[PDB]
Design a protein around this ligand. Structure first.
Ligand SMILES: N=C(N)c1cccc(C[C@H](NS(=O)(=O)c2ccc3ccccc3c2)C(=O)N2CCNCC2)c1
Ligand SMILES: [Ca+2]
Length: 223
């Protein structure tokens, strides 16, 4: 997170860290056994880490559970990052408590202007590489589709939305991928891509989760 702030220990209880000997992506706990992340985060040998703040220290409240299966959306295109969504099933259910809780799916899409909370352990620098120990947070508004499309001509599909600041300086970045975009207590998006990080007139593009609620529900119900 570039331009964000320290969240505070376990203030984002649905935030998940995908680990494989190191943190490589984020995710969101949607129920005790299912995590929603980004398709481009797909990798084998995934350990899901819940209740994390400092990802390098064992402070307590953590729960390390292996992923039993990762279901990348069938129509995901690795070049356009369209349908950039993936479901991870936990080998065991998580122990839902105060510091580890699930987030709700949207029953409707969020409109431009809605303020959302984006979080993750990704790069904090625009020009360079700096990774945080603790979870960073960033509040950013969902931009308008015209603006989103004016920034990324011919690259935005109906399953994507822009969020962030056109002036730059505040944005998600590498390592945040898969992470949540919560608007009004509903998981509205997934950190997907963007041209660089926190650049002028180049806001972050996120996967529009509201277009996938049915798919998620049906997929989870069949596995
Ligand atoms: N600015 C953001 N909000 C943001 C969020 C996540 C990741 C990145 C870094 C990167 N930005 S980039 O300019 O290097 C970039 C942009 C679009 C891409 C599309 C396909 C493949 C790689 C791409 C890399 C990126 O978009 N990806 C990381 C690698 N995999 C796909 C997503 C930026
Ligand atoms: Ca920890």
């Amino acid at each position: 997170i570039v331009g964000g702030y320290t969240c505070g220990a376990n203030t984002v209880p649905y935030q998940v860290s995908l680990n494989s000997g190191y943190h490589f992506c984020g995710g969101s706990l949607i129920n005790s056994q299912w995590v929603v992340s980004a398709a481009h985060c797909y990798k084998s040998g995934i350990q899901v880490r819940l209740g994390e703040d400092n990802i390098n220290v064992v402070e307590g409240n953590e729960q390390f559970i292996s992923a039993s299966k990762s279901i990348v959306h069938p129509s995901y295109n690795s070049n356009t990052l369209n349908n950039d969504i993936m479901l991870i099933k936990l080998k065991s259910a998580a122990s839902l408590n105060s510091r580890v809780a699930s987030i709700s799916l949207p029953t409707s899409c969020a409109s431009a202007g809605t303020q959302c909370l984006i979080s993750g352990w990704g790069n904090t620098k625009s020009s360079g590489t700096s990774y945080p120990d603790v979870l960073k947070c960033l509040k950013a508004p969902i931009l308008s589709d015209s603006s989103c499309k004016s920034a990324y001509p011919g690259q935005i599909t109906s399953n994507m939305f822009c969020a962030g600041y056109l002036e730059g300086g505040k944005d998600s970045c590498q390592g945040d991928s898969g992470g949540p975009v919560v608007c009004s207590g509903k998981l509205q998006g997934i950190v997907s891509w963007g041209s660089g990080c926190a650049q002028k007139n180049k806001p972050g593009v996120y996967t529009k989760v509201c277009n996938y609620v049915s798919w998620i529900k049906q997929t989870i119900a069949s596995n």
